[PDB]
Design a protein around this ligand. Structure first.
Ligand code: BCL
Ligand code: BCL
Ligand code: BCL
Ligand code: BCL
Ligand code: BCL
Ligand code: BCL
Ligand code: IRM
Ligand code: IRM
Ligand code: IRM
Ligand code: IRM
Ligand code: IRM
Lengths: 49, 94, 49, 49, 49, 49, 49, 49, 49, 49, 49, 49, 49, 49, 49, 49, 49, 49, 49
């Protein structure tokens, strides 16, 4: 292998992994907001009551 | 490097072969010819002309001009300017 | 968190718009589903009788 | 405010029309939803009885 | 009036047809909405009973 | 009459088919709208009872 | 008959299929419209009772 | 029979699939139309009562 | 100007005008058949009666 | 059987997927048509009363 | 003019005319089968009766 | 500035403005016909009566 | 089994996604068909009466 | 003419005709299976009874 | 597990977005199906009577 | 920076801002007409009455 | 002929035939699972009973 | 790394972050207007009353 | 054969197989979560009861 290898997308392995950190953080941030939204829905809607 | 808000870690490192979280093996290797699971043969080889199953001939050979099956002529020859079928003129050139 | 190398074979200019777009479409679809199959969600918008 | 580098891998000529377009489509969908599931919004347009 | 540089990254051959097209489609959608949710707009076309 | 330079940034091979096409589609939509929301237009086609 | 130069800026390989295609689609739409909004056209196909 | 030169400006790889495709689509539409607007065509498939 | 100038579509002005003769003649032929079809519809359908 | 030269002007990578795709779509359309306009086909799936 | 001129589609005038012979012959054969199909429909369906 | 500058669409400023003359005149022709069509609709339909 | 040479004229990057995609779409269509036209399939999901 | 001429699709005349043999044979096999399917439908369904 | 070489002929930038996209679409379709054809799934969202 | 820099769309900053003047002025013209149209709608329709 | 000839898809005859072995094996495996699914459907559903 | 590195979209890091300032400020402007619109909707509609 | 052969997608055989390991592992992880989801559905819904 070669860490300097430019892959067909133009990104190196290090660049692809650094990019994915934004995707994982974005997913976790979306999940945290969704968890609060589900808690509010449970507290105010008749769901699960 | 990126400093996310959702704590750490954000990604898992990999310094070699991918390790499956669902155990192993993950793929099956091949030493050569594809070994099918549904027995053999998998394909029929062609040594020359395409051996049809619905008899022969399969195509009609064409020599020279196209032999119209709906009589003749099939097209109207055009010489010079276009022969209008809806009278004239057909344009208002600048 | 181990799929970080996907951006070496999937172009971010395509996969990132598709990811964020699809997530947004799914949220819209879930809202429309709960809105059509519940009485409390439309009643919430209708408010005062 | 930390995603500013997304435009290095997503082409602005694509992502900006998609962003502005999607935001506009979502607004239309929310208007149609409240219009179809409420009585006060159509009555507002109908005005005088 | 401060977004004038958008045409440096968004191609006018794409963004101008999309802008003019979207504005036209939105106008059509608003007409169909008021037509479907009001009695006075269809009656206006029906005119004399 | 002052937008004549639009064809320097919008390709005529694209903008002219879209213009003529959109104008035609809008006309069809207006015909279907008046046909669906009026009694005199369908009766006109039905003619003699 | 004065628009003959349109084929210098609109590609015939695109404009001719779109022209012939659109004319055909419009004809189909007019047939479906008269068929849906009249009684004599469906009765014509039903023929003898 | 005088339009034979159309293939010099319309690419056969595009115009021939569109021709055969459109002719087939038109035929399907006519079958669905007569099937939906007549009683004898569906009864023909229903066969013995 | 130059009559030999090949435009972006590949056709010269003279070629674009010669092509348009078929479009104008084709439109006139389609119109003639449509006029007859409208006459038959008037004679046999209750439209305009 | 005399159209064998069509593959010199229609690319097989396009015409063969379109052919097999269209034939499959036509078959699906005929099944849905007979299923919707007959009683014996749905009853066949319903089986034992 | 020059009969050997390769047009943008790659076909010469003579090749485009020879190709069109198949389109005209195909149209005539499709018409002949459609005429028989219309005759059978008249003989067996209540149309025109 | 330079009037001879070929823009990305291939047209010069003078060529784009000459093209737009057809669009402006075409819009005026469409408007004139539409005005007559609206006059006929008023005279014969119950709209505005 | 004798069609193995189709991949010399149909690109696998196109024909394989289309094949696997179509087969999946057909399966979905058959499930929706039996679900809509039978009583036992929806009752199976409904479970206990 | 030249039988070795590579046409725009990349196939020669001989290669296009050889390919069409598979299309004709495939059509004949599809027809044979369709004939049996129609025979089974006649024997078991009320169609033509 | 033996199909690992498919990525040598199917581009991952295409097949991976199509796979993950299709799987997500299938899940949405199954949720909509059970929601529409069962009483307990909508009742679950409606919760307390 | 460099004011002569040709951006990926082909327009310079000065050209993009000059183009945007038409979009801003066009938006103001559309807004002015829409304001009059809303005034007419208020005066003649029952909305806000 | 030449077995080393790279065809337009990039695959040789031997490579296309080897690829088709996966397509045939995949079809046979799909068929076997479908056969079991049909047997289970017959044993548990009222179809064919 | 290199701050002068032109990424696949053609923008440098500094250019992408400068562009994002317009997206962030635009989102804040959209949000402020939406907040006012929600306040008006609450004051005049029966929602939350 | 040659393991260093770059195939049309740009991936070598070893790279395609290494990529597929993620696809197989992803499928197995998706399956495991789906199995738990089906168990929860059985325990809480009336399905199979
Ligand atoms: C404040 C909420 C932040 C957050 C802030 C932190 C902090 C702070 C830490 C971590 C740490 C961790 N986080 Mg985090 N993290 C969040 C979302 C997530 C989600 C997810 C929702 O799917 C996951 C899987 C993770 C994953 C993880 C691990 C990598 C790590 C150790 C385990 C752990 O749970 O620690 C404990 C994690 C938590 C107590 C929070 C988990 C998220 C909860 C469930 C979100 C609900 C809403 C929350 C209460 C309020 C915010 C609402 C806003 C509208 C967003 N984070 C959100 C976006 N995370 C820890 C670490 O090891 O860092 C080095 C750590 O110190
Ligand atoms: C804990 C849930 C994890 C998981 C963790 C493990 C672990 C841990 C191991 C395997 C191992 C194996 N796994 Mg796994 N695996 C899961 C999902 C799957 C799925 C699937 C859902 O479709 C499949 C087909 C497989 C496939 C396999 C085989 C390659 C292998 C079993 C060989 C054997 O005979 O072992 C005989 C049995 C054993 C050695 C021990 C028991 C392992 C059993 C068979 C795992 C069954 C998982 C089951 C299908 C899914 C349960 C999901 C839960 C309901 C959440 N995994 C999920 C993601 N898997 C084993 C292996 O060979 O690794 C080298 C192993 O040790
Ligand atoms: C275990 C189920 C496996 C399978 C495993 C095998 C095995 C094992 C063998 C074959 C062999 C053959 N298979 Mg296989 N095969 C399956 C699916 C298929 C399907 C299909 C479903 O459409 C087809 C058309 C084929 C085609 C064929 C022929 C190329 C060949 C000769 C069969 C025959 O009747 O020989 C005449 C009869 C016999 C030789 C003995 C009896 C039949 C044997 C047991 C194969 C029957 C498979 C049957 C169609 C599967 C139906 C589905 C299952 C019932 C669930 N396979 C599935 C995926 N196949 C055989 C061969 O010639 O290999 C060299 C062989 O030994
Ligand atoms: C077994 C079913 C096979 C089949 C096997 C054969 C065989 C075997 C032969 C042909 C032969 C012929 N086939 Mg075939 N063929 C089938 C499907 C078709 C279909 C179609 C369904 O649309 C067509 C149009 C054709 C076309 C033709 C002609 C080129 C030729 C018959 C005329 C002739 O010169 O006969 C001259 C020969 C004879 C008169 C001998 C008797 C042939 C009989 C009449 C069978 C003809 C095929 C018949 C239409 C198939 C119907 C199948 C349905 C399932 C019922 N085949 C299917 C896929 N075909 C024949 C030929 O010329 O081969 C060199 C031949 O011997
Ligand atoms: C067998 C059915 C075949 C057919 C076989 C033939 C044959 C055989 C001949 C023609 C000939 C002609 N055909 Mg053809 N043709 C068919 C379909 C068509 C259709 C169509 C359906 O739209 C059209 C417009 C044509 C067009 C024409 C003309 C180019 C030409 C007559 C010139 C003339 O003035 O003759 C004046 C009149 C005559 C010479 C004699 C009487 C007319 C002859 C018998 C042709 C009538 C065909 C008729 C229009 C379509 C019948 C369809 C069936 C009822 C299903 N064919 C179908 C596919 N055609 C003729 C020609 O000139 O060939 C060199 C000829 O001999
Ligand atoms: C037979 C049916 C043919 C037809 C055959 C002819 C013939 C034949 C002539 C023209 C001529 C003319 N045609 Mg033409 N034309 C048709 C369809 C059209 C249509 C249309 C439907 O939209 C239009 C706008 C035109 C346009 C015109 C003008 C350019 C010109 C008359 C100007 C003049 O000097 O008048 C005064 C001219 C005369 C009194 C001579 C006779 C004019 C004929 C009667 C005009 C018929 C046009 C009419 C709209 C056709 C309606 C369809 C039928 C009901 C089937 N044609 C169809 C396709 N056309 C004429 C020409 O070229 O002049 C130099 C001419 O001689
Ligand atoms: C309608 C009704 C009623 C009913 C409908 C009934 C019906 C028909 C249902 C059908 C259902 C079906 C068929 C379901 C199928 C489901 C499947 C197949 C799921 C598959 C999941 C796959 C995954 C999750 C893949 C992840 C891949 C991944 C993450 C890949 C990562 C790759 C990387 C990192 C690149 C590395 C590159 C390098 C190594 C070179 O560096
Ligand atoms: C229909 C019914 C009834 C029911 C349906 C039920 C059903 C099925 C529901 C399914 C739901 C599912 C599956 C939900 C899934 C949700 C997911 C996965 C959310 C993911 C969010 C991801 C985010 C937010 C990513 C942000 C990325 C970001 C910001 C990336 C930034 C990148 C940058 C800056 C480039 C840097 C480059 C360099 C570093 C080189 O400079
Ligand atoms: C839906 C409801 C209720 C209401 C809606 C009502 C409504 C709005 C309806 C609107 C209807 C409209 C707008 C209809 C318009 C119809 C028109 C415009 C028809 C035009 C037909 C044109 C034709 C036939 C052209 C043939 C061209 C041809 C054959 C060209 C041939 C070219 C060649 C051979 C190349 C030569 C190359 C070289 C020069 C080198 O030789
Ligand atoms: C919906 C309701 C109620 C009402 C709507 C009613 C309504 C509007 C209906 C309208 C219907 C219309 C308009 C129907 C029109 C039908 C037409 C036009 C059919 C045409 C068929 C043409 C065919 C079959 C062509 C075959 C060509 C072929 C085989 C070409 C072969 C070429 C080759 C071999 C290449 C040679 C290369 C080299 C020269 C080098 O050898
Ligand atoms: C649906 C409901 C209920 C409600 C919706 C209500 C609603 C919103 C309605 C809205 C309606 C609107 C907006 C209508 C707008 C209509 C307009 C704008 C029409 C414009 C027509 C333009 C034309 C005809 C242009 C012809 C151009 C031409 C022929 C150009 C020719 C060019 C050439 C020859 C090239 C020269 C090359 C060289 C320079 C070298 O010589």
């Amino acid at each position: 292998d070669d860490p300097n290898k430019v892959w067909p997308t133009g990104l190196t392995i290090a660049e692809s992994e650094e990019l994915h950190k934004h995707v994982i953080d974005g997913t976790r941030i979306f999940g945290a907001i969704a968890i609060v939204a589900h808690f509010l829905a449970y507290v105010y809607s008749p769901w699960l009551h | 490097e990126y400093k996310g808000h959702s704590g750490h870690p954000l990604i898992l490192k990999q310094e070699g072969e991918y390790k499956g979280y669902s155990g192993e093996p993950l793929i099956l290797k091949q030493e050569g010819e594809y070994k099918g699971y549904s027995g053999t043969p998998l394909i029929l080889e062609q040594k020359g002309e395409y051996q049809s199953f619905s008899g022969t001939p399969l195509i009609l050979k064409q020599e020279g001009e196209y032999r119209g099956f709906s009589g003749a002529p099939l097209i109207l020859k055009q010489d010079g300017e276009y022969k209008s079928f809806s009278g004239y003129p057909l344009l208002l050139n600048i | 968190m181990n799929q970080g190398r996907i951006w070496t074979v999937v172009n971010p200019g395509v996969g990132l718009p598709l990811l964020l777009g699809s997530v947004t479409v799914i949220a819209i679809l879930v809202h429309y589903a709960v809105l059509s199959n519940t009485t409390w969600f439309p009643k919430y918008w209708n408010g005062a009788t």
